[PDB]
Design a protein around this ligand. Structure first.
Ligand SMILES: CCC1=C(C)/C(=C/C2=NC(=C\c3[nH]c(/C=C4\NC(=O)[C@H](C)[C@H]4CC)c(C)c3CCC(=O)O)/C(CCC(=O)O)=C2C)NC1=O
Ligand SMILES: CCC1=C(C)/C(=C/C2=NC(=C\c3[nH]c(/C=C4\NC(=O)[C@H](C)[C@H]4CC)c(C)c3CCC(=O)O)/C(CCC(=O)O)=C2C)NC1=O
Ligand SMILES: CCC1=C(C)/C(=C/C2=NC(=C\c3[nH]c(/C=C4\NC(=O)[C@H](C)[C@H]4CC)c(C)c3CCC(=O)O)/C(CCC(=O)O)=C2C)NC1=O
Ligand SMILES: CCC1=C(C)/C(=C/C2=NC(=C\c3[nH]c(/C=C4\NC(=O)[C@H](C)[C@H]4CC)c(C)c3CCC(=O)O)/C(CCC(=O)O)=C2C)NC1=O
Ligand SMILES: CCC1=C(C)/C(=C/C2=NC(=C\c3[nH]c(/C=C4\NC(=O)[C@H](C)[C@H]4CC)c(C)c3CCC(=O)O)/C(CCC(=O)O)=C2C)NC1=O
Ligand SMILES: CCC1=C(C)/C(=C/C2=NC(=C\c3[nH]c(/C=C4\NC(=O)[C@H](C)[C@H]4CC)c(C)c3CCC(=O)O)/C(CCC(=O)O)=C2C)NC1=O
Ligand SMILES: CCC1=C(C)/C(=C/C2=NC(=C\c3[nH]c(/C=C4\NC(=O)[C@H](C)[C@H]4CC)c(C)c3CCC(=O)O)/C(CCC(=O)O)=C2C)NC1=O
Lengths: 160, 48, 68, 161, 160, 160, 161, 161, 160, 160, 161, 160
């Protein structure tokens, strides 16, 4: 969180939290209910976001659902959208934590190696997350859609 | 814990690659550590 | 003149390093008393597990002959 | 470490014996397999990633292991696991070239059982990952080399269990 | 061996054996049959090599078999030839492996400290080894005599 | 070369070359006139091994020369066949050097990062490299074809 | 560093040239002298200490250099000087094996002239120590190797002057 | 570590006592033997190498220990063994100067029994190597110092057994 | 002691004691009886010394014994003289040891942190020690008074 | 000196000199005139001392001065006594400095390597030094003879 | 480093001379002032902190130096400056004990002028801080030692300017 | 200066100065502040530059400080460094003015005749100046070091 990242700095210098550190915890926690609303909206539309992301992805790059494609077939496709469902979940976690610690340990450190092993185009995959952001950004009112959008763009950022 | 240290030439900090190239493997150790008997310096040659 | 004899298990959790590393993470080492407070903190701030500790060298009594 | 040849030299050195006739039979065998061990080693090397993308598929992934709560859940841990797999494959290839398992003890097995207990790494699942790579290896290397490669994978796997 | 040396360097860069550090092994395998044969030949004449080495040595350095000499007397001379028998044995080991390896661990690392304690003159041990080269080399074909000679000159080198 | 690799180990341990190291330089240099001759066959047919490789590569994986393919078009293909020409050249260098030093600095160290940037599909490239082995190997005697084949399989090994 | 086999590759790589006939001829000219280089290195290595001893005796000691006021006065400096001598001998043996002087520039000559000026180390006297070791080396290694060993000692000595 | 004098100071410090008559008597009993300890150390130090050689000759070499299969077979292990011997001699000389065995526990005995069990180092044979050096030492140092040197060799040897 | 210090330096450089180190042990031990007499005299007058130091202190700093002073009151003053008794004791130890090892581990390493916590003014503790020097020194011959004085000035030095 | 040694330890621990360190400087400097007298006497008899050492040496080791001996001949013997003159000089330096710093940098560090090269038997150089102790010591009072003797036994020690 | 005594030994060693009358006279001139040097060091050491405080008060603080824009503005830099002051005092005390300024060159002055130019540290102001500590020192140590302490403060200050 | 030189050429022609000549003077004025600064920097390190120049000189030309050398002895060397101090001073003058002018009149016109009389080897004075360039130049930024370097190379030029 902001807490985990910051306290760590306190303990490492053998000291209590600074006025600054205390202030940011206060400003952060004040921005809580809003962040929780952003996660709720997106949790509530997860199935729509994933599939519409999946259509947006395969138009922008179909070849993956073709004879020599990594996601070719019904159960090779059932896995690609499942991975898109995984990353949307991690994005909701990140938004409520206010940083990436959780997103990072769960789904980027070791990935690139992971995707590479399986031979999936990494840029294919970031389209798909970028596509999920669009469907989801549209089930939220203008203020909440932006707050959600930061976490989508983070995942898009990390995967590359 | 267990890698014996080696020379580095690291890229990152800015200016550090060239400083590193210069400190190690470009400029050796001068100055004799002990202070016991100064080397005289008037005799380069070994004729015989 | 006092050496503790610790044992730890630290698991890398930020990088997936690619060569070797077995002894880097599961090892026994006497570390002198002056430095053992920092080595323990360093093991703990990496999510390490401090399995064992011992006095090893010093008497577990003190005052004269300790802080040499 | 030691190989076939230094295993014999050190066994005689401790007795201070010059190499005698039966010992020399043993060295003759190692030079007879030296061609196949080298050709075979090469094949594995360039096909490594392909090989490793078949052992995981038949013994690790599509399972609870890769799902939340599983030890190879997270890209971090999935990466660590197939990293390990590469170690095993690579060292078994060393052991088989050397014709001696001593390197598998010195640089792979020593402390590894407890390291895995301490992290929670599932031992039985790791053995299946070893015995699946053996299965693939034995197809790729052919009649000449199949039995000889196989034993050092079996050495690895009874070293954990 | 050649194998041990190649491998130890390999594991050191987390790498696979490359096309060079394979060619040497192949050369060694062909060489090994010849190498094994040379060692057997040396082993057959061991008693003659040692004894004639011992005469060649005491002519060239009579001082070691004299009042204040390390090898003065019948049983101080008996141990001296036994040490010459030890080193010939190690030379057969070195030849067969194709790499000196084991001989170093068995009879040069620590040899200065051992002989300094016993007060044995090291450079006259080096002479005893040259003397063995001369005898052994006269029982081998030109090509095999050279191949053997490298290992004799190594021991001579290490006692230095 | 074998030398560049056979000396670096010497200097790093602060020592003269071993009998083993000297022997392999010996055996290596004896195989010179012949190694030169295997690398001359391959320059003869430089553009014909490459053209033939190109075809095999695209049967086993065509999609690269299709609408959304990295090598789609006449000059996106000219570049691809050109990269195959590059690697055949490096393979001739390696064969005459007797190791990979040159092959490595010129075309594998950094190759992941280069091709990831270009989003050329690297793993297709390994198959393309493999095809050249098949063609080149059919223009060489059994013994020379194997010696060449080690260097092809190295690139295939690195490359991925 | 570079060696004859490696230099041919990097010299052509910068031109993007396949190895051609001229290149292949150069590499042959190296390989064809290779066995002789190895034998010569084994003589030098195994006589290392005697070469330094005979070279010092002809060109350094029994002189003002070893007397008070001289640069190799004190056991400290005498030790440093014959330590240096061993470097030269050892590296020249590398250069001669490689058939390329580039290592003598990269790891021995670079900055050494000024290092010696800064400490007061007599350059001319050091060159004589180099050319005396060459003299001894050329006797020990024989017709086969004499000219080839010699040049890298001459490379060293015109690198200081 | 502690010596005679700091042994007393720390024993009183934990009680927070100024030194009293009993303490002062102990310290006198040390100071009054001090000059003799120094002379004895100078004999041991300057005969160090001869003591090891005579102790090895009476108690270690000319035996199965130095033959193939023996723990002091190989120049490597022979060197390690007489290296150890030098430690013992040197530290016993420290203990005897200090008039306190505490240094022999802190820097020599702690873990050594098990270290020797783990390597296979023969304990009984090592004790004889200690008690042979004592025998030699007691001749060289004379009536003045014989008993005082001897005890710290005996401390060492009952520390292993 | 002088012994401990000499030895620790010996062992740390893996060597027997120097002529210098041996000489100082000899000069030190010759002063044994004298050093013991210096400690006896001071032990014999301990109650008087602490007191006269305590008077000298409260004249020079009547504030420490004032409303906002660390030693204000009868039992805050009782503990203060007890600390003065502690340091005189350590000074007798140092004199008989011929160095500070004991004085240091018992009462200077950690003393800043201890007294900072208690909020004791360190430099006025240094004054209490000067005051003890003045009293103790008036009960010793010129030569013995100087020898004692070095150890008083050390403690004064370490609280700094 | 005693000064250099004390200071170097002071500076390395970032501190002023200890009471101990100050005491030894004081005891040392008090012995100044005596130490200067010891050096004078020995300087005054230098030619006699080396000679008597040289006779004592050649009786005990007539071999060094024999066919295969390092000091065999008139000018191989002349250099040998010159080396004995060198070490007596260094011994006078050490005595006036009160430690070995000067003796060490000038004539023991590197001495093994120097003499091994020249093939000089080190332990017979140690004997030449014992021989000088015997002569020098017979020209000094009991107390001064011991003080001198420590420095002779040091050199004897360092050649070991 | 060198002191009075080793200055003489090394000056003669390079000529390979036994110490003669002129040398012996120099060493006497040092030994004869030795007890006074020790007493002076004990005064400086034990008044260290007060000397810095009185020297800063006369020559540094209550000024533009300690105000915003000044080099000893900020607790960080004020601390660094009086830290430096302690170095000077401490090393000058070493130089004066040794009776040789060589340590002030080796461990204090070398590169310091340019280090101060590079950070912006005011040189003239630092010299006044040195010459103020000298003033205080010369009062505290008395007639016996005043001139001898003073010179190494003067060595320090002409080393910067 | 630049001013003097421009004007003297103007007056010789008896016509007011030009308007692009009013360009060199303008450049010089801007340059002068930088030029003044370089001279001050050189002045600050004068003693270090001279001394280190003097060491660099006597290594490169030990013959001048030898039996038949112009600078042989302590006070023949003292005057030699004083002359090196003179020329560094003139170099600071030259830099500041922007034109060499005054330095010529002060220290090159007549210098051949002066030094020929004293029998000073002129070309080794030129070396002493190169040595000063090397030291001075290491205390100046790249741009300022070049600007200074022109004036050093001038003096080196004029002694020729
Ligand atoms: C050179 C010889 C060598 C080996 C073999 C080795 C193994 C090894 N595996 C480790 C962790 C691990 N090993 C695995 C392995 C697996 N996970 C699974 O679920 C599967 C059953 C299995 C793969 C088939 C995992 C997931 C971790 C990470 C544990 C953690 O999160 O801390 C670690 C801890 C340090 C690190 O994380 O890198 C070591 C040292 N280290 C060595 O030096
Ligand atoms: C929460 C952290 C986390 C992630 C993300 C994760 C992904 C993951 N993706 C997988 C497969 C897969 N993933 C994909 C995904 C894609 N195919 C494409 O071409 C596209 C680029 C992309 C969809 C956007 C495909 C096609 C497979 C099947 C590959 C195979 O079976 O060889 C598998 C192996 C199957 C399994 O056992 O579950 C894992 C573990 N595992 C994790 O623990
Ligand atoms: C010797 C080491 C080395 C290599 C290998 C190298 C490759 C390289 N390939 C390039 C382009 C290219 N390379 C390819 C290659 C391919 N397209 C495909 O789909 C296939 C997978 C593949 C052919 C097998 C293509 C299509 C381009 C053009 C890409 C562009 O212009 O955007 C370029 C940029 C064009 C240029 O300026 O030359 C470089 C530098 N450069 C080097 O220094
Ligand atoms: C001050 C430090 C110092 C020392 C000690 C020193 C010794 C020294 N001894 C030498 C030779 C020698 N030294 C000896 C000495 C001996 N022969 C024996 O057998 C006896 C064991 C021993 C006499 C006790 C001999 C015989 C030589 C001639 C060796 C030769 O020329 O090969 C030489 C070479 C000749 C020369 O150029 O001077 C040096 C430099 N140099 C130094 O800078
Ligand atoms: C790996 C390549 C390499 C080389 C070659 C090397 C040379 C080298 N020689 C040095 C000193 C020295 N070199 C010598 C050499 C000699 N004295 C004489 O009178 C003779 C003319 C000559 C021997 C023939 C001496 C005496 C010193 C010591 C100078 C001193 O006292 O500081 C030093 C200074 C550090 C030290 O003392 O070790 C270096 C770095 N360093 C390197 O890293
Ligand atoms: C395989 C490795 C290895 C070696 C080489 C070895 C040598 C060795 N040589 C010994 C003695 C000896 N060695 C010699 C040898 C010689 N005398 C001379 O003057 C000549 C220079 C030389 C004969 C060429 C002599 C004379 C002794 C008896 C010394 C004594 O008893 O003091 C001893 C002690 C006696 C014993 O217990 O065996 C050992 C251990 N031990 C080992 O483990
Ligand atoms: C912006 C960062 C900064 C600070 C804070 C700072 C403080 C500072 N306080 C000073 C003195 C002082 N400061 C105090 C303060 C106090 N006396 C007490 O008893 C109270 C506890 C406290 C008032 C709350 C006193 C009494 C002096 C005079 C001390 C003396 O002259 O010896 C001085 C020396 C006088 C001078 O030259 O200005 C400085 C530099 N300097 C800085 O650069």
């Amino acid at each position: 969180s902001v807490l985990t990242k910051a306290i760590v700095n306190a303990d490492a210098e053998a000291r209590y939290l600074s006025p600054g550190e205390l202030d940011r915890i206060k400003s952060f926690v004040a921005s809580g209910e809003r962040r929780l609303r952003i996660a709720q909206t997106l949790t509530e539309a997860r199935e729509r976001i994933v599939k519409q992301a999946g259509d947006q992805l395969f138009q922008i790059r179909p070849d993956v659902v073709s004879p020599g494609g990594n996601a070719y077939g019904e159960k090779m496709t059932a896995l690609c959208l499942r991975d898109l469902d995984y990353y949307l979940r991690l994005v909701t976690y990140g938004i409520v934590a206010g940083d990436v610690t959780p997103i990072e340990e769960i789904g980027i450190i070791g990935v690139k190696e992971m995707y590479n092993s399986l031979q999936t185009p990494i840029p294919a995959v970031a389209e798909g997350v970028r596509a999920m952001k669009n469907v989801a950004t549209s089930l939220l009112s203008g203020d909440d859609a932006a707050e959600a959008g930061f976490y989508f763009d983070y995942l898009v950022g990390a995967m590359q | 814990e267990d890698i014996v240290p080696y020379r580095r030439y690291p890229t990152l900090p800015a200016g550090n690659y060239r400083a590193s190239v210069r400190v190690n493997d470009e400029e050796l150790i001068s100055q004799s550590w002990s202070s016991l008997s100064p080397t005289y310096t008037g005799y380069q040659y070994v004729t015989r | 003149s006092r050496y503790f004899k610790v044992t730890a298990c630290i698991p890398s959790l930020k990088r997936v390093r690619t060569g070797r590393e077995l002894q880097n993470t599961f090892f026994t080492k006497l570390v002198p008393y002056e430095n053992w407070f920092t080595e323990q903190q360093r093991i703990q701030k990496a999510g390490g597990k401090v399995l064992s500790v011992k006095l090893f060298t010093g008497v577990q009594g003190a005052n004269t002959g300790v802080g040499a | 470490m030691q190989d076939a040849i230094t295993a014999v030299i050190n066994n005689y050195d401790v007795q201070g014996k010059y190499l005698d006739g039966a010992a020399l039979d043993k060295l003759k065998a190692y030079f007879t397999t030296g061609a196949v061990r080298v050709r075979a080693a090469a094949v594995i090397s360039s096909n490594a990633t392909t090989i490793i993308k078949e052992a995981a598929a038949k013994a690790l992934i599509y399972s609870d292991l890769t799902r939340p709560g599983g030890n190879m859940y997270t890209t971090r841990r999935y990466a660590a696991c197939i990293r390990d797999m590469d170690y095993f494959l690579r060292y078994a290839t060393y052991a088989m070239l050397a014709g001696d398992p001593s390197i598998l003890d010195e640089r792979v097995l020593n402390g590894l059982k407890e390291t895995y207990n301490s992290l929670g790494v599932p031992i039985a699942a790791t053995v299946g990952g070893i015995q699946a790579m053996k299965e693939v290896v034995g197809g790729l290397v052919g009649p000449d080399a199949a039995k000889e490669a196989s034993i050092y994978f079996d050495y690895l796997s009874s070293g954990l269990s």
